[PDB]
Design a protein around this ligand. Structure first.
Ligand SMILES: *[C@@H]1O[C@H](CO)[C@@H](O[C@@H]2O[C@H](CO)[C@@H](O[C@@H]3O[C@H](CO[C@@H]4O[C@H](CO)[C@@H](O)[C@H](O[C@@H]5O[C@H](CO)[C@@H](O)[C@H](O)[C@@H]5O[C@@H]5O[C@H](CO)[C@@H](O)[C@H](O)[C@@H]5O)[C@@H]4O)[C@@H](O)[C@H](O)[C@@H]3O)[C@H](O)[C@H]2NC(C)=O)[C@H](O)[C@H]1NC(C)=O
Ligand SMILES: *[C@@H]1O[C@H](CO)[C@@H](O[C@@H]2O[C@H](CO)[C@@H](O[C@@H]3O[C@H](CO[C@@H]4O[C@H](CO)[C@@H](O)[C@H](O[C@@H]5O[C@H](CO)[C@@H](O)[C@H](O)[C@@H]5O[C@@H]5O[C@H](CO)[C@@H](O)[C@H](O)[C@@H]5O)[C@@H]4O)[C@@H](O)[C@H](O)[C@@H]3O)[C@H](O)[C@H]2NC(C)=O)[C@H](O)[C@H]1NC(C)=O
Ligand SMILES: *[C@@H]1O[C@H](CO)[C@@H](O[C@@H]2O[C@H](CO)[C@@H](O[C@@H]3O[C@H](CO[C@@H]4O[C@H](CO)[C@@H](O)[C@H](O[C@@H]5O[C@H](CO)[C@@H](O)[C@H](O)[C@@H]5O[C@@H]5O[C@H](CO)[C@@H](O)[C@H](O)[C@@H]5O)[C@@H]4O)[C@@H](O)[C@H](O)[C@@H]3O)[C@H](O)[C@H]2NC(C)=O)[C@H](O)[C@H]1NC(C)=O
Ligand SMILES: *[C@@H]1O[C@H](CO)[C@@H](O[C@@H]2O[C@H](CO)[C@@H](O)[C@H](O)[C@H]2NC(C)=O)[C@H](O)[C@H]1NC(C)=O
Ligand SMILES: *[C@@H]1O[C@H](CO)[C@@H](O[C@@H]2O[C@H](CO)[C@@H](O)[C@H](O)[C@H]2NC(C)=O)[C@H](O)[C@H]1NC(C)=O
Ligand SMILES: *[C@@H]1O[C@H](CO)[C@@H](O[C@@H]2O[C@H](CO)[C@@H](O)[C@H](O)[C@H]2NC(C)=O)[C@H](O)[C@H]1NC(C)=O
Ligand SMILES: *[C@@H]1O[C@H](CO)[C@@H](O)[C@H](O)[C@H]1NC(C)=O
Ligand SMILES: *[C@@H]1O[C@H](CO)[C@@H](O)[C@H](O)[C@H]1NC(C)=O
Ligand SMILES: *[C@@H]1O[C@H](CO)[C@@H](O)[C@H](O)[C@H]1NC(C)=O
Ligand SMILES: *[C@@H]1O[C@H](CO)[C@@H](O)[C@H](O)[C@H]1NC(C)=O
Ligand SMILES: *[C@@H]1O[C@H](CO)[C@@H](O)[C@H](O)[C@H]1NC(C)=O
Ligand SMILES: *[C@@H]1O[C@H](CO)[C@@H](O)[C@H](O)[C@H]1NC(C)=O
Ligand SMILES: *[C@@H]1O[C@H](CO)[C@@H](O)[C@H](O)[C@H]1NC(C)=O
Ligand SMILES: *[C@@H]1O[C@H](CO)[C@@H](O)[C@H](O)[C@H]1NC(C)=O
Ligand SMILES: *[C@@H]1O[C@H](CO)[C@@H](O)[C@H](O)[C@H]1NC(C)=O
Ligand SMILES: *[C@@H]1O[C@H](CO)[C@@H](O)[C@H](O)[C@H]1NC(C)=O
Ligand SMILES: *[C@@H]1O[C@H](CO)[C@@H](O)[C@H](O)[C@H]1NC(C)=O
Ligand SMILES: *[C@@H]1O[C@H](CO)[C@@H](O)[C@H](O)[C@H]1NC(C)=O
Lengths: 479, 479, 479
């Protein structure tokens, strides 16, 4: 009789978008992973000191508040608010100091110390009885006042340094310590990778009057000392300089850049593990992209996007009289039949696995291209702490918006390439049958052949393995 | 004889650009609307006070200059230049104050007042005889000088606040009012969503000497008072603070953000109406995009672009021996003929209307995509006043340049999709005829069939409605 | 017998990337030019004063250091480091001054002078014996001190102006010159296209103490004068103002913007010429794009990119029983044969030259589009000096990264268009032969015809120039 080849009919599932049209497919999936409803923290440590410490207390090494000086640092931390009192002095901070101290207290790297150099250069530090419980500071009080100097040093890592002043609100103490006159203004300047400065004057003058009013009082109500801070930045291989006068203060530590821990905001669950966490949940194992609105994460995580897209997973449906589909039931994507159901239908295997492999190859290439584009956009030598510190109070990142469009543009090309490859694979099989049958059989030109003799089920399945021969089927003639 | 189907030949009009080639089409149009030569302002109000007021006079509520305190505000306004004198004090402004006052005097929203809170907190305001014609200011003069304080308040909308000082150039008055010494420097600071400050000193010192020289004199030549201003920004839900000392001044009003009117620059015409206006003309009704170089407009207007593009409006011309065109005259885009003119040609209707609808569908989808991209680029909660205030003196916007390329990229995809859809529509009609005629008629494979018998005009037009039958045409045989 | 037409088989060279697939081609090239290992400077002048001058000495017109006051300026220059001493005063610079003097000393344009206006407005300049070897400065010392003034002037070009102070470290000299008190602070302000200021006080006070310590000493060890500088910017058509008090100093010259020379970093070679040079080498003649990481160059150079790409140069290979290739040896890209080698094969010429011209046309259009995009990105009225001055210490430019992706996107479209045009050219030739042979010869449908009679070598080459006739080949019949 006659034989035909083609695909197997399956119900339609969805539609995808290509360059020139919309296609109907029997299966599709997504590229991104979705957030969970909890945090999986099996085999981890959690640090919590929300009842005793504050943000400032950690920097100054108060008694019992020493997160940044530990050998092993947990990846989850929580502490009190920024306006929490201490047990030593009263303190005042500027806006930049607040912005950088929101981050610098929980870095996961190593910190550098240079107090001994100052001690050996200028002698012993000043002493007071109101700071018995604090350790990390250096007070410059020379014998001859004011005696300005300039201190220069070569840095070791990239990070931030805090500097400022420490003064009392009594006029007699101010005159005895500074050695200046009340009706004067004097500055402290920091020059590094950038430039910064701060100004001071007498107690009953500007701008010290505002500092006294805006300060945060301490637990002990008999403390008369206020310390005012500000920040500056350094670089690894260069030299930084500070101008010093009698009365200035500096914290002798460099907080090197790196990664910082996250603060949980949802319920914490044990007895389950993962490898990528955020402040609002975890993510599934082995993902290629993450649906997130920032770049702050702990663990090993892929890049981030703002929304999700669809990618083909099956094959296109092109059918409704032969049209290209086979009504039989077969365990494959391609088949050969002779208008018989149950025994007159057979399936091949090579085309199925080739079509399977094409998708994986194309998807891997697209993922690699996306990774390279991300690296170009953000740079090879990047640090999360610096990236989030530079943003400040802004919650919108333009680079994420720029990156999101690239994936949307790439998905269409991926779909088009996959479909064209499937068509190319399908085209070749039709040629291997025409040359195999010979030139004595006519072809309908629509994938269905029509043979000179009768072709039974064995005739059909012998073609599938390709061991077909013409010698034993010559008998009888029919059209 | 034989019959053929195809399109109708029409003269060529232009060319369009697709992904892979340039196409020749019989009709095209544009996406953007062009500016007019005048302003259509029928049924509108125009405000003009160019002969009496100035920009500063409006903020201080001078006698007869009260634009920002009206229930109904017109959409067109004009006033005098910025260096126009007043009838009260002498005044001095900084650069930021000038930049923001170029806009804040003509907002179309609501303004908030908080003078009563200050009055009930610190008592009555200071009094002088040189400001009898002004109302909108508060002067802080306590009994004990200087007496610094800090004032904190929770805001209601998002906007700008002006603050500064008011002093005389006589030494005795300065000492009597401020209560300080001449050889001193004192500051006023504003902290909100950002930070700002300003400094003052005695009359025969810096920087007051420059303030005296650079000031703008008043109409009355016996005024000895200069008021110096500066600006700051607030946010809706947060708290803002001001540092006050004896002698400072603040204008107790918040100018909320929103839209502001335009100043006509061309001839104004009545007796004609529109719904979108700019400073250089109006735009036609019902446009989808606007050819304009800014985002400042009044009314209901679509997004803006920097140049214009072309979009297909007819069908592609593919012809020069049959080639695919019909030389007859028909009232449609598709037809059937038998090499006869006048009576041997007929036209169908379904294909024409389907091809008509495809263009509308594709164009609507493209427009929606463009709107979504614009919203992503600029943000959902946006205000024109803030957007133009942040730019400053720059006249080039990069976001418009980024947005312009997106439309150019989208137009090519639109054209490609439309052409492919037209080809898909055309392909199906050829199949419905082969199955209708039957298997006893050969096909030339180029859209022309060739029938076994003679096929007259009734034979031709019966096919058009699809009521063709084979029983009554069997007689005679010819090839 | 039978005849066939097609291409000529050549070995495969490489692969290129298109919209929907990867193609195999017999030839390809690149779009960008690569750097050399030296500098070609035949017929050029080189300036070198690394042994006597410094950067600061050039601005002040020291004896023998006068680069910015020459009629003809060489395109290569080199001088000493920034901290080189002079023979006059001691000097101090800020960060912005350093950043701008890294560039302004080697501009190739014209500079403007306005000293005579100052002389005629305020009289003769101050005189000192420590600056006998310097000429380019103006010192304001009026008879009555301090006597502040404001100086306003309309500019001529766009550029930078340096201003500041000149003072001694002795208390008596300070009091005698300035006419102020030691416990005071006074400022100098510059308002133009932007705003800037600087502050000064007494010798044993802040911030003069830091200035004295950080200064650079002069060759003569008996000089007691320090000059402190800062910078400001102007615009062509506007007015700029300066606040002056007794003791200020200004350099009366405007350094107009333009191009500046390069400093060689590699070996310099004569006896060879080019037309585009950089600091690390030269580039080949007649290039369309340059592989560079900046926009600083001298000569006539095209735009710059960060990496290189591939562009097709031959024709696609589509073959492995005829498949479309001819095994004969021909001097062309297309040919006709009759399964005979040596004398039964001929080549045409028109198709070859048409295919050659298509590539040139498409490439030229792409290059023009790229040029227009570059002009849109950077602006029509641009200056290298201003562009690099605004960047500062940053070594990464985002606009180059944005521009690099455009070329990568354009190359794919170029390849697709070229391939489609080649297919369109190839398709038409097959039609001109079917109509020429007539309707009495069958066609195999794969580019090979099959004729009713025998067709020899003269028969083959008769088709080549198209003068074939059917009358003399009618004899005999065969299939
Ligand atoms: C010290 O530094 C810390 C680190 O920077 C500071 O932490 C930030 O604090 C902010 C104040 O609380 C906080 O902002 C909040 O964010 C919350 C986010 O949770 C929401 O959950 C919703 C579902 O329940 C989401 O719908 C919502 O938005 C979505 O986010 C998706 C990503 O998961 C997007 O794909 C979606 O499009 C969707 O919309 C986005 O919203 C973003 C804003 O959240 C927006 O930027 C983006 O463009 C999309 O439009 C969101 O996920 C909100 O519920 C709160 O209302 C509030 O906005 C920051 O997130 C904190 N930063 C980080 C990195 O977590 C800390 O404040 C600082 N300390 C001090 C004292 O300043
Ligand atoms: C208070 O705030 C106000 C609001 O910001 C300030 O108003 C601005 O004042 C500026 C100074 O006058 C003014 O700049 C002028 O703009 C005019 C524009 O008119 C021109 O008309 C020509 C035809 O006759 C056009 O060819 C020309 O440019 C075109 O614009 C098309 C859009 O319509 C573009 O599609 C074209 O490409 C073309 O070229 C553009 O030109 C733009 C500059 O105009 C350029 O930015 C863009 O990239 C294209 O290259 C233009 O339309 C000019 O004639 C004047 O020469 C001058 O440039 C601003 O437009 C005002 N702002 C607004 C929003 O109108 C006000 O100054 C301020 N007060 C104070 C004291 O500062
Ligand atoms: C006054 O102004 C001057 C002008 O701005 C200042 O000159 C700058 O001085 C810098 C300090 O020396 C200098 O930075 C150096 O650049 C060198 C570049 O030479 C390298 O050669 C290598 C081959 O041997 C390349 O591999 C290397 O990088 C490549 O560059 C290619 C372009 O040729 C790119 O296509 C490649 O991708 C590749 O990688 C790039 O590197 C770039 C950094 O160089 C990077 O920005 C880019 O994104 C790519 O990643 C490079 O070509 C280095 O060897 C040195 O290590 C150092 O980085 C600047 O180049 C100078 N500026 C100019 C315009 O030349 C001068 O400092 C200033 N005076 C003062 C006192 O400040
Ligand atoms: C997701 O990946 C994590 C990898 O950290 C898996 O956690 C490990 O699972 C293996 C397999 O049982 C255990 O031997 C390890 O002890 C686990 N790690 C830890 C730290 O306990 C986790 O099982 C994976 N989850 C899923 C669903 O596959
Ligand atoms: C453009 O649209 C405006 C919409 O404001 C039209 O103005 C209105 O036109 C209708 C129809 O005559 C009138 O009844 C209204 O009174 C008009 N509005 C006002 C405020 O007077 C305008 O006619 C339209 N123009 C064109 C050419 O269509
Ligand atoms: C590259 O172009 C330069 C153009 O400046 C060529 O230099 C000129 O070459 C011509 C031809 O011999 C000479 O007559 C000129 O005198 C050269 N210019 C100078 C300034 O000497 C150079 O020869 C070209 N190089 C190549 C390899 O083509
Ligand atoms: C194909 O074969 C079937 C049965 O053998 C026959 O009915 C049909 O006419 C054949 N078709 C052609 C085109 O020969
Ligand atoms: C498509 O397949 C998925 C996977 O099984 C299934 O969840 C979904 O319901 C299917 N779509 C439809 C419309 O049935
Ligand atoms: C400290 O800050 C928290 C943050 O909301 C606030 O509730 C609390 O009132 C503040 N403490 C004081 C003393 O103002
Ligand atoms: C303070 O001023 C007085 C008088 O002006 C002066 O005698 C004294 O030396 C000054 N003190 C300092 C530390 O400068
Ligand atoms: C088509 O019909 C016409 C007239 O009936 C005839 O001249 C021509 O040869 C026919 N073509 C074919 C291919 O049969
Ligand atoms: C194309 O059609 C428009 C609309 O009628 C017409 O204005 C234009 O002249 C036409 N183009 C040509 C080349 O005739
Ligand atoms: C005020 O500004 C205008 C703007 O051009 C100017 O013409 C006028 O001279 C200025 N008035 C004074 C007094 O300078
Ligand atoms: C001004 O200075 C003098 C002397 O230095 C002092 O007696 C007087 O109290 C000062 N006045 C004020 C308001 O500080
Ligand atoms: C083509 O011609 C050759 C020789 O003339 C012959 O062997 C072959 O069968 C012909 N092919 C067809 C389809 O007629
Ligand atoms: C491709 O052609 C170029 C030009 O001659 C040659 O240098 C290169 O080796 C060729 N490629 C291969 C793989 O032979
Ligand atoms: C001047 O700068 C160079 C730059 O490296 C440095 O080597 C030299 O030591 C500096 N001179 C002085 C006196 O510091
Ligand atoms: C400096 O101060 C003294 C006392 O305060 C005063 O007598 C003298 O006039 C002042 N000198 C100047 C130049 O202001």
């Amino acid at each position: 009789n006659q034989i035909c080849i083609g695909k197997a009919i399956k119900p339609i599932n969805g539609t995808v978008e290509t360059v020139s049209r919309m296609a109907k497919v029997t299966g599709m999936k997504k590229v991104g992973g979705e957030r969970m409803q909890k945090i999986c923290a099996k085999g981890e440590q959690i640090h919590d000191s929300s009842s005793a410490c504050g943000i400032v207390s950690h920097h100054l090494k108060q008694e019992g508040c020493d997160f940044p000086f530990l050998l092993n640092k947990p990846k989850f931390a929580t502490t009190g608010p920024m306006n929490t009192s201490t047990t030593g002095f009263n303190f005042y901070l500027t806006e930049k100091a607040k912005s950088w101290m929101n981050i610098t207290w929980r870095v996961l790297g190593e910190n550098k110390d240079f107090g001994d150099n100052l001690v050996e250069k200028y002698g012993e530090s000043g002493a007071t009885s109101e700071g018995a419980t604090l350790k990390n500071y250096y007070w410059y009080v020379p014998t001859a006042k004011p005696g300005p100097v300039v201190y220069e040093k070569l840095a070791e890592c990239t990070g931030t340094i805090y500097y400022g002043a420490l003064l009392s609100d009594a006029e007699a103490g101010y005159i005895a310590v500074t050695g200046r006159n009340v009706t004067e203004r004097w500055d402290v300047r920091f020059t590094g990778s950038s430039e910064s400065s701060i100004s001071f004057s007498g107690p009953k003058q500007s701008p010290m009057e505002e500092y006294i009013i805006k300060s945060v009082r301490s637990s002990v109500d008999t403390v008369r000392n206020i310390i005012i801070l500000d920040s500056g930045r350094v670089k690894k291989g260069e030299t930084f300089s500070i101008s010093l006068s009698s009365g200035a203060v500096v914290i002798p530590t460099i907080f090197c850049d790196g990664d910082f821990a996250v603060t949980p905001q949802v319920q914490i669950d044990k007895d389950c593990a993962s490898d990528c966490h955020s402040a609002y949940g975890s993510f599934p194992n082995g993902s290629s992209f993450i649906i997130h609105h920032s770049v702050h994460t702990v663990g090993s995580c892929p890049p981030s996007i703002l929304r999700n897209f669809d990618v083909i997973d099956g094959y296109e449906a092109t059918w409704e009289f032969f049209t290209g589909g086979i009504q039989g039931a077969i365990d494959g994507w391609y088949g050969v039949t002779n208008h018989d159901t149950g025994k007159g239908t057979a399936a091949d295997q090579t085309s199925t696995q080739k079509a399977v492999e094409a998708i994986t190859n194309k998807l891997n290439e697209a993922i690699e291209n996306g990774n390279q584009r991300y690296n170009q956009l953000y740079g090879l030598a990047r640090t999360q702490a610096e990236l989030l510190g530079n943003l400040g109070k802004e919650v919108n990142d333009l680079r994420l918006e720029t990156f999101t469009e690239f994936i949307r543009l790439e998905t269409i090309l991926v779909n088009t390439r996959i479909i064209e490859e499937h068509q190319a694979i399908g085209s070749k099989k039709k040629e291997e049958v025409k040359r195999l049958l010979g030139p004595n059989a006519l072809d309908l030109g629509n994938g269905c052949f029509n043979l000179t003799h009768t072709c039974d089920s064995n005739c059909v399945n012998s073609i599938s393995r390709g061991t077909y021969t013409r010698e034993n089927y010559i008998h009888n003639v029919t059209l």
